[PDB]
Amino acid sequence: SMNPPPPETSNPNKPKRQTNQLQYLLRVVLKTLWKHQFAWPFQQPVDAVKLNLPDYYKIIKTPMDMGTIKKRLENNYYWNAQECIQDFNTMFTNCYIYNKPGDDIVLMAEALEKLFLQKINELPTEE
Numbered sequence: 001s002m003n004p005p006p007p008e009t010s011n012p013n014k015p016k017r018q019t020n021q022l023q024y025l026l027r028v029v030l031k032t033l034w035k036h037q038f039a040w041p042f043q044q045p046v047d048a049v050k051l052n053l054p055d056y057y058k059i060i061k062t063p064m065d066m067g068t069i070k071k072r073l074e075n076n077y078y079w080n081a082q083e084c085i086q087d088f089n090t091m092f093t094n095c096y097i098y099n100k101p102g103d104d105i106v107l108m109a110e111a112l113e114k115l116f117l118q119k120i121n122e123l124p125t126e127e
């Protein structure tokens with residue numbers, strides 16, 4: 001069993017910049033979700049080897065996790081807020097695609113996603 005390489009967190013060929021919206025995504029959104037009691041499964045890529053999920057990366061072809069997002073934000077990898085919001089949405093959707101309704105991990109994702117929605121509702125206007 002083998003895990004894929006993780007999503008990239010640096011790439012000099014990718015355009016990037018800082019925006020006040022990306023700063024909010026780090027200081028408000030990511031921080032809020034990261035500290036939540038249910039954050040831990042999402043703080044790093046799914047280790048399909050150790051979790052004994054050999055089909056995970058056969059169903060989930062665009063993996064994402066908050067460890068990756070955190071590094072992307074800290075590294076100023078993004079060009080805009082939409083790219084980062086998309087990464088969060090990918091992470092949640094992957095969990096729902098792979099798992100079953102009512103599963104613990106789905107309940108965890110739903111709790112995080114509720115907080116994500118509450119925070120992105122107040123994304124600031126771009127300066």
Ligand SMILES: Cc1sc2c(c1C)C(c1ccc(Cl)cc1)=N[C@@H](CC(=O)NCc1ccccn1)c1nnc(C)n1-2
Nearest residue numbers: 040041042045046047051053094095098099104105108
């Ligand atoms: C470090 C990680 S990452 C992650 C997980 C863990 C531990 C876990 C997880 C499960 C329960 C709770 Cl309380 C917390 C997390 N779920 C996997 C899916 C999975 O193991 N299915 C088979 C199965 C069999 C029996 C019982 C439950 N699931 C998963 N899917 N997306 C993410 C992210 N995970």
